[PDB]
Every structure is written in C-alpha cells, then in structure tokens.
Subunit: 257 residues, 3 copies
Amino acid sequence: SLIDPRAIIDPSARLAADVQVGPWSIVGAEVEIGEGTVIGPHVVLKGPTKIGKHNRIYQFSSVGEDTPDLKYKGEPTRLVIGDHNVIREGVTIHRGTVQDRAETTIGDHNLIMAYAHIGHDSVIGNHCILVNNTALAGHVHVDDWAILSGYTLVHQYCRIGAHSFSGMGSAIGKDVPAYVTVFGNPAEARSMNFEGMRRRGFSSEAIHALRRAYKVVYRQGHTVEEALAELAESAAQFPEVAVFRDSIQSATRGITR
Amino acid sequence: LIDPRAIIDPSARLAADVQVGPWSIVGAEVEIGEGTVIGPHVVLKGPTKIGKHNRIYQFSSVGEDTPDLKYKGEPTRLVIGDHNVIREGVTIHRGTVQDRAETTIGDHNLIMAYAHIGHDSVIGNHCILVNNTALAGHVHVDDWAILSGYTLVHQYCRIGAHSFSGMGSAIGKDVPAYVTVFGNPAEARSMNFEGMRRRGFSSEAIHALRRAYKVVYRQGHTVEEALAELAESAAQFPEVAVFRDSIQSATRGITR
Amino acid sequence: SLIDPRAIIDPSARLAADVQVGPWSIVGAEVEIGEGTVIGPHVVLKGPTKIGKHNRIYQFSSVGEDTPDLKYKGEPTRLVIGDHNVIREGVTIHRGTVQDRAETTIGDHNLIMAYAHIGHDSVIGNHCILVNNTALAGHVHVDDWAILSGYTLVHQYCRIGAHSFSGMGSAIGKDVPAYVTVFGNPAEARSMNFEGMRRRGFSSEAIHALRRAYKVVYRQGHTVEEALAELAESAAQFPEVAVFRDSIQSATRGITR
Ligand SMILES: O=C(/N=C\c1ccccc1)N[C@]1(C(=O)Nc2nnn[nH]2)CN(C(=O)c2cccc(C(F)(F)F)c2)c2ccccc21
Ligand SMILES: O=C(/N=C\c1ccccc1)N[C@]1(C(=O)Nc2nnn[nH]2)CN(C(=O)c2cccc(C(F)(F)F)c2)c2ccccc21
Ligand SMILES: O=C(/N=C\c1ccccc1)N[C@]1(C(=O)Nc2nnn[nH]2)CN(C(=O)c2cccc(C(F)(F)F)c2)c2ccccc21
C-alpha cells in the first residue's frame, strides 16, 4: 500500500491490503476499496460505494457522484464495482436512484475509457469495453463482452446484448440484441460481431447458426413471436443462439432494426 | 468554509457563507455570492461574477479565455446568476470585445458534465444542457430550453424558449421557441408539448401553438407569409407571440 | 519561484530554467520540458516524454499516459511535442506502441482545444486546429494546417491531409485527401477548403488546378488507379496537386468520397 498524505480519506472509508491512493484524491464517506485497487491522483470517490479488487481508476474521474437529473437526491443509493476493472481519465459513474434500482452495478474485467459516462441505475456485466466518451443516460444494461465504440450515446432503459458492437458516434434508442453490430445516429442494425465470436472461440457451426439467426429476426418479415418460434430448435442445440433468442425475447419495447 | 488548501486571490470577493473545496483556485476579480458551494479541483478565473446558491463541481474551468484566435487578452467578463448547478468538468469562457465582451448565464440552469459554453453565449433561466453539450460562441439559449447529450451548436445560433434537441444534434440555424430538433444536421420534428404541459399552459394556448407549428412548417408558407398569418394568434396568446418573435428575430434561417 | 512548491517534479525530470509549473501538477520520470513552456495547475505529465519551447498546457490534461489498447504490454514508448503548441483543459495524449515506431508526435503551432484526445502513435504536423472533443483513435497522421471541427472522430490509421477541414461531429473512417472538406457521420467529401487556401494566400492558378484535380478523383467514375494516372500531369506542374495526389497514393483506408 501507499496512501499519499495529500489524499483525503474519510474516517468511515474502508481500504483493504495493497490499496494505493494518489495525491489530492478524495475517498469520501461509505467508500469501501478492495485488495490491490489503485486510485490515481486527482480522483473523486463518493459513497455509499463498494469497489472490489485489483481495479485501476485514473485521474479526474468522479466515481459515485449523485445524478444531476434530480434536484432533491434520494439516499442511500449505491455504486458497486467488481474486480480487475480499468476506469480511464475523467470517467463519470453515478450511483442509483431511490425510484428505480437504487444501485449502479459494474462487474469484472471491464475497460471504461476516458470521459465515458455511466448514468444512474445502469448495470455493466463482465469483459465489456466502453470507448472514449461513451455515455449511458441511465437504466442501461450492458451484457458481457459488449463493445461500445468512441462517443456511443445510449438512451435510458436500453439493453446492450452480450458480444454486441456499436460503431463510432452511434446513438442507440432501442435494445441491441446479443452479437448485433449497430451504426449511426439514429442507430441501425448492420450485421453480427463474427470477429468477436471467433476471438472468444465459438465453433463454426455456432457462428453459422447465429448468421441464420440474424436473417430469421431481421430479413424474413417475421413478427418477434414467429422469430422466437423459428429460433427455438437452433437455440436448444446452441447455447450461443439461446443468448441471441433470450436478448430478443427480453425486448418488450422493440429492437434496433 | 474556505478550505485551507484552496487558493483565493487577494482581489477576489466572497459572501459570508461561500464554501470553497480543497485544491480549488478563486483567481483575480472573481466575485462569488451567498450560499454558493465551489467543489474541490475547480479553477475560477475573472473578471467573473457568480450569484447566490450556485454549486460548481470538481474539474470545472469557469471563466477562462476563449482559444478563438480573434481574442487577444482584453478584460472581457463572464456573469452567472443564482440557483445554477454546474457539473463535473464544465468549461465556460468569458466574452470577446467584438460582441458585448460578456458571457451570460441566468438562474436555475442545470449544466451537466463536460458541457462547454463558448465566448459571448447568453443562457436564460431553467435551461438544461445535458452532458457534453457544446455552444461554440455567441449562442443565445432562451428560458426552459433543453439540449440533450452531445448537442453541438454553431456560433450565433438562437435556441428558442421551450425548445428541445435530441441526443447528438448539430444545430446550424436558429431553433424557434417550443420546436424539437434531431440529428446532424438538426431538423425540425415537432413542438415540446411536454414542456408546455410542464409550465401549466391552458389547452387553448397548446392548440394555438400546434396550429402555429403547422403554419410555419406544414403549409408550404414562406417565413414572411408564416409571420403574417400568426400576427392575430400572437395578439391573442402571449405564448404564440414568444414563438412568432423567435422566428421574426431569425434572419439567418430557422431549423427545418 | 516558477515551479509551484505544491507541484511534484520527479528527480529524473529535465526542465529549462524559465519553465513554469502551476500547483498540484505532476512532472513525472523521464519528462523533459523546453524553454518558455507554461504548465497550468492540475496537469499530469508522464514519460518518457519530450516537450519543446513556448508550449502552454492547461489544467486537467493527461499528457504521456499509456494507451489502454490491449496490444500495448508496458514497453518503453515515447511522446514528442514541438514548440508554440496550446493544449487546452482536459486534453489526453498517449505515448506510442512498439507495433509501429513507439512514438506519438506533435509538431509546432498546434491548437488542441478542451477534451481533445490524441491516441497512441498519432502524428500531428504544424499549425493544426483540433477543436473541442476531437478524438484520434491511434496511428492517425494529421498533416499541416488541417482543421478538425468540434467532436470530430477519427478511426485508427486514417490520414488527415494538409489544409483539410472536417465539419462539427464528423466521423472519419477513411483518409481525407489534402485540401478536402468532409462533413457528417459517416464523413462525406463535400468540396475543397477554398476559404482556408485563399486565407493562407494560395495562388488563383493553384486553386483552379486543385478544383480540376478534385473533379478527376471524385466526379469522373475513375477508380483510384485511373485517377492517380489522370492526375500525373497536373501533379507534375503544381506542387499543391502533387500534395493532393500523394495523399490519395498514400491512403491505406481508401479515401472519403
Ligand atoms: O431526461 C432525459 N432528457 C431530458 C431531461 C429532463 C429532465 C432532467 C434531465 C434531463 N432523458 C433521456 C431519456 O432517454 N429519457 C427516457 N427514455 N425512455 N425513458 N426515459 C436521455 N436523454 C439525454 O439527453 C441524456 C440524459 C442524461 C444523460 C445523457 C448522457 F448523454 F449522458 F448519456 C443523455 C434524452 C434525449 C431525448 C429524449 C429523452 C432523453
Ligand atoms: O466558431 C468557429 N471558430 C472560432 C472559434 C470560436 C470559439 C472557440 C474557438 C474558435 N467555427 C464554427 C462557427 O460557428 N463559425 C462561424 N459561424 N458564423 N460565424 N462564425 C464553430 N465550429 C466549431 O467546430 C467549434 C468551434 C469552437 C467550439 C466548438 C464547440 F464544439 F466547443 F462548441 C465548436 C464550426 C464548424 C464548422 C464550421 C464553422 C464552425
Ligand atoms: O482502434 C480500435 N481498437 C484498438 C484501440 C486503439 C486505441 C485505444 C484503445 C483500443 N478500434 C477502431 C479502429 O480503428 N480499429 C482498427 N482500424 N484499423 N486497424 N484497427 C477505432 N474505434 C474506436 O471506437 C476508438 C478506439 C480507441 C479510441 C477512440 C477515440 F474515440 F478515442 F478516438 C475510438 C473503432 C470503431 C469501429 C471500428 C473500429 C474501430
């Protein structure tokens, strides 16, 4: 451990073994930091916030702030961050709202690049990448391995499916199904993230069942109900297709087309 | 109240109950008013006036020089009213001598993280600038206007009262009062009926304003023709006069 | 003195005797700063980094950090900045990767406005303007006098030609030839920077030949090869047309059309 004496550590904060806190950082009341986490210089941490192990948080980041969206803040709302996350320069992460989840949740092994915004009540899974200035407005669910390219904007309540991909400057207003590639403002479905399936070792059979799964949903004039029925068999054979099918079935307010 | 690790210039001026966080700079000729909380890690530069019950969050640079090459160090101003919330990393520049030598913000404005307010810009009251909104300079934002995340505005554009931009809009012409605009480049879509409900507009003044939108946008009229038919509706409803006056004062083109 | 006592200066740092450094700034290990350079408060400089003379770096800037690019594995890579550059509030500049030439390079007289990003292995020439929140992903070459308007996004390996211009919110995925004006997401070729050419004092004859050069590349159904061959003659007569022609010849991502 090195706790720099120019940092401010609230008496109610809890620091585990091997935690580093750089100069002029604030570890506010009710912030818990897990084993081996490195807080850079000029970082503002605010609670109630739970941060796990072996995280890295860069300078000028505001982690666990209140949403500005309310004037009168509800407390106590939480921020939970898991393990092995990188949070780059100037990132903003807001805690939840009493109305909704009362918690913003980030899992493990995520890369959140400079000036990205994680809005109130959002949930990030594991192994996600949010590129520079990605902004999640609030109540955004990002499932595992999803990649949002630089300056991707996401409206409230949108679901970003597992292994999905957004192009630079995408503006997402509807759910993105698992594996789907989206581009533009407003965002449009283009293809699937075949590159990602390969890099995570999907069988060719799985990749071909997912290609056919795309066409079923987007290209053959079927209701969502008819697509779910058509996808049932492929979904039962391939867990990878089931992830796709589940992402479409969970979309009650429709999907990015 | 003033944290001892903050830097207060001799020539600054702070009201009784002003709070200033650690590692913040209150530079030369900065006035701060009653009940204003300056966060930690804030750079204020002057000549700048800040009113009362304002909150400025960490990493904000309020009152710097414009990098606009037309600026050359003249002692231009920035003025900020009361009950404003300025969030993480906001940049606000002072005026230029070429145009009035003042940047102006009124009252009850919510300016979210990394928003930029360029030289000589004039913001009214009860405005929302969502994350990373950017006003290049000489942008006039009238009362109750809402600019959604990453809204970009070119110099000299007028954003009308009760107007709304969608996420990632790029505005290059005046937005009339109450008009909703979307995309890059921004195009007119509808009227902020929502925002009229929010101000307790009579259902008559709301029907008057729906008619007004159809006169301007949906009936192949010119602006001169559209301004002409509105004249009586604007005499009848002050709410319609607001809309009519925003179009009248828009001799660079309105957003279509 | 000119080094604020609240600044951190690494023992291995090399500062010219007149260098100014504001409070709570960090001048890291293996950072060199040349004559006349003013470092504002709250600035983080990481090395190995060379900064030249009469530069100005504003608050909340992170100059010389490691790229988050997963391909980078902590190797000793560098950042070189020249003279008379203005770096505004919250600018991020990353050092290089060994996969290229292990250097990020900025020339002279550049204006880099607030929250602009310069990614690993990028090369900026002289007299360039990067307006607020302009982002260069990596391996981006911006040649002399190019202007990138606010929130211009550039993909890796894209080349931005001399005296080129991008409109507000441009998303560039292909090379911008010298003198060309681009707008939109995705970016679209919309004429040449005649305003900028006229201002900088380009001759009438050079402009007229560039107008014709534009027609050959964009407006005659020619493929890049046909166009290069058809340009050969004017490229041999007018240096500006040679700069234009070379920028098409050197394009590795194709050209913005
Ligand atoms: O709320 C919003 N807009 C204006 C506002 C009003 C009062 C207070 C603050 C902002 N929310 C927005 C939203 O997605 N609302 C919604 N959709 N479904 N259910 N709720 C997201 N939004 C935005 O512009 C927005 C809001 C917060 C954060 C961000 C960002 F950029 F950081 F991600 C962006 C927008 C733009 C147009 C319409 C609706 C909304
Ligand atoms: O305004 C501009 N240049 C001077 C400048 C102003 C402020 C700071 C630095 C330079 N350029 C712009 C402009 O609106 N010029 C103009 N119109 N009418 N009269 N002048 C805006 N502009 C921009 O890209 C721009 C310039 C400054 C700030 C911002 C932002 F994002 F922070 F808001 C954006 C742009 C993009 C394309 C064409 C013209 C212009
Ligand atoms: O480049 C990318 N990923 C690696 C990386 C680089 C720098 C930092 C972190 C990761 N992805 C991108 C790329 O250009 N890849 C590529 N092209 N040629 N060879 N590779 C760019 N990219 C981006 O979204 C991107 C990546 C890093 C930084 C930035 C920004 F915004 F800061 F400028 C943007 C994107 C979006 C869609 C497709 C491909 C790519």
